Curated annotation (Swiss-Prot):
Cystine residue pairs: 240-257
GO cellular component annotations of the record: extracellular region
Modification after translation: The disulfide bond between Cys-240 and Cys-257 contributes not only to the thermodynamic stability but also to the kinetic stability of the enzyme.
An example molecular function term from Gene Ontology annotations: cutinase activity
Organism: Unknown prokaryotic organism
Class of the enzyme per the UniProt entry, highest EC level: hydrolase
Subcellular localization, as worded in the UniProt entry: Secreted
UniProt KW keywords: Disulfide bond, Hydrolase, Secreted, Serine esterase, Signal
PANTHER family linked to this entry: DIENELACTONE HYDROLASE DOMAIN-CONTAINING PROTEIN-RELATED (PTHR22946), POLYKETIDE TRANSFERASE AF380 (PTHR22946:SF9)
Chief localization: secreted
Temperature-dependent activity: Optimum temperature is 50 degrees Celsius with pNP-butanoate as substrate. Optimum temperature using PET as substrate is superior to 70 degrees Celsius. Shows 70% of the maximal activity at 30 and 70 degrees Celsius with pNP-butyrate as substrate. Has half-lives of 5 hours at 50 degrees Celsius, 80 minutes at 60 degrees Celsius, 40 minutes at 70 degrees Celsius and 7 minutes at 80 degrees Celsius. Is thermostable, with a determined melting temperature (Tm) of 84.7 degrees Celsius.
Gene3D superfamilies reported for this sequence: alpha/beta hydrolase
Entry protein name: Leaf-branch compost cutinase
EC number of this enzyme: 3.1.1.74, 3.1.1.101
Amino acid sequence: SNPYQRGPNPTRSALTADGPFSVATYTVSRLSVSGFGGGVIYYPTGTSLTFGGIAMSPGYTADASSLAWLGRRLASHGFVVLVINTNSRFDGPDSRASQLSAALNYLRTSSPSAVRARLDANRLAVAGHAMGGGGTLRIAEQNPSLKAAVPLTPWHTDKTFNTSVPVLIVGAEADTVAPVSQHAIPFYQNLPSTTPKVYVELCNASHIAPNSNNAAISVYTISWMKLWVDNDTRYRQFLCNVNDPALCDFRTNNRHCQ
């Protein structure tokens, strides 16, 4: 019996909409915290259970509202999710990594009463869009205690990350900001072969695909977090032997399937 298991037996359909958990929001002002620019916490309410934590970084010149739908989506399926604002909208990927670190420390140590009540501080993960995706890869390299990392259409000038943290990268086929050939695909291939890794490439998708309700991003982000943060093997079925018409490529070393 898995003590971290949450919600009913999943259907793919159920992972394309908000999950069974009611979502509370807490606005963290940038002057209320050090090491990052505050943001919005999406967390389960109407429940006495504890859940894993996710720090999520938006991309260059973007704010927390650019990943609001996904923070809510993940929270609704049973996670405490802090979508950060950066100290500056112009902060680079390695700056975003440091702020994700401060955000994770904040959630564990100085988050509001209702948030701490729902958080299992032992089970933490990271995700991010673009330069935020770059930051996600960097913090994974720095913090091997993290359960999972989901870089969404990630951007970074460095291509090789020495992380053991399970990584699922979402590439957008027609990305002109972070071209998959220069960013996402190199990141995937340059990850250690012993690191549980998945690459999904969205058919004819743009760089901003992760900034609005996206069925595929929903399915793969929820499933990866569920499998690694909660040890919930009910979500293997969505990450193993995948034939998804929304994907124009799917790659994995298949370490997560048994």
